């Protein structure tokens, strides 16, 4: 009825567990509000608003730059950066060769003919393009120009080209992506790969550390030089770029999650309260307890007057 407001929050798949907690905490404070959450790869999440005509009160992505590139200026005009993450290679203890995989031999294990691994669709999900970025960055770190070629390029139509030191991969439209089903499985968002690994259909998958921990997967920590986790290695990460099918270019960057309130939000006031919760100490702790490092203090890409005291604007 008129005493039941719905706050619509569309978010990155990797924010699924944190969102359950944000929803419970928010509703405890606003008993007449139902926070309606929907998970999808961040680019697909944004398209709900930018292309499908749906209205959301809060948009949260796993890569703040997608809000900037896809929503400015028609659907948003500021982004608050509130969390970080790290790419790891996760598996079950009964995954093929789980007993021998480690940080030094991970890519050789993935190269074995019977090993199947997964990553999400780069056109829809930052985890997917970040997975390809990490594998290509591995070529530079291990001084082995064939890691990406053997694992991905020979098992799909996804290929990195070199251009004066940097590498660029141009994505085919999603409908034209080709994958060798004997070696790789892809899904729109990384969260959808979870059940494939649990069923044994996949042995390994590229995924955020927080999600691996939340779902009880073991994992190989990859070099900081390739895992997109540290602000301090931005210069190395920037050597790889992926051009998404929608034409937007994403560059390897330290993983930083963004949140915004779309310009056309139906319940802006409540949305402000929700964003405040996410970047408050309570919200930072919710993330930490779920295995995801919060960005403390939160930052914004531009002034955000209705939230000035909560954010650092450079
Ligand atoms: Mg190569």
Curated annotation (Swiss-Prot):
Keywords on record: Cell membrane, Membrane, Metal-binding, Molybdenum, Signal, Transport
Organism superkingdom: Archaea
UniProt: molybdate binding residues: 13-14, 42, 125-127, 190, 208
Major subcellular site: membrane
GO biological-process terms attached to the record: molybdate ion transport
Similarity field: Belongs to the bacterial solute-binding protein 1 family. WtpA subfamily.
General function of this protein: Part of the ABC transporter complex WtpABC involved in molybdate/tungstate import. Binds tungstate and molybdate.
Name used for this protein in its record: Molybdate/tungstate-binding protein WtpA
Native species: Archaeoglobus fulgidus (strain ATCC 49558 / DSM 4304 / JCM 9628 / NBRC 100126 / VC-16)
Source taxonomy: Archaea, Methanobacteriati, Methanobacteriota, Archaeoglobi, Archaeoglobales
